[PDB]
Amino acid sequence: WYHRIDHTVLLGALPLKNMTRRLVLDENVRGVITMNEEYETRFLCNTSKEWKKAGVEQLRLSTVDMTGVPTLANLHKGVQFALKYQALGQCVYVHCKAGRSRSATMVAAYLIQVHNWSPEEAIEAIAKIRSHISIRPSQLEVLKEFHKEITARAAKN
């Protein structure tokens, strides 16, 4: 249903209400990145308040319609959110629907920034762990721009 990517990030299909307990206690999930929350499927998942109750903060992000990826700005929001919890030694569950594409792209951006890796290095790392990762050219191009921004911010240090 989901796979651990590293000590902080997990990537998986939409989290069912019933999984909350396991995710929080066993996987130390204290944050959740929710992409493209759809009204047709939200009865299956926690609301933002049901997450609070379990002590996890939810960050909701939208993809740029038809792109499969958020804006650069929201990619940075997602990554900084993950890093927030990395500093706390806690975990973040990253999802959209199937945990294969839009959510995979978000995790890719995280890995790019964390490791100063190429988009393809990050993607291949994710695919080595979780099957059916599918990051399309439209999604890869944004990860390419994200990679350039990460490098330029790194040169400022």
Domain tally for the chain?
A: 1
Q: Give 147's contacts (C-beta < 8 A, 6+ positions apart).
A: 112, 118, 119
Nearest by Cα to 11 from 80, 87, 78: 78
State the CB neighbour count (10 A cutoff) for residue 60.
Answer: 12
Question: Which residues share a beta bridge with 59?
Answer: 33
Where in the sequence is the domain holding 156, given as residue range(s)?
Answer: 1-157
With beta carbons less than 8 A apart as the criterion, state whether 124 and 143 touch. Answer: no
Kindly state the tokens that stand for 60.
Answer: 């909701």
For the chain, the farthest-separated pair of C-alpha atoms sits apart, in whole angstroms, at 45
Distance linking the first and last C-alpha atoms of the chain = 39
Query: How was this structure obtained?
Result: X-ray
- The enclosing domain of 75 has a CATH number of 3.90.190.10
Separation CA 11–CA 2 (nearest Å)? 6
- β-pairing, 2-4 with 9-12? antiparallel
Query: Residue 97 phi/psi, 5° resolution?
Result: -105, -70
* Dihedral angle over CA of 115, 85, 11, 49, nearest 10: -160
Catalytic (active site) residue 91: no
| Angstrom distances, CA of residue 4 to CA of 46, 65, 67, 70, 71 | 20, 28, 26, 22, 25
> Which residue is catalytic, options 14, 19, 69, 96?
96
In angstroms, how far is CA 112 from the centroid of its own chain?
12
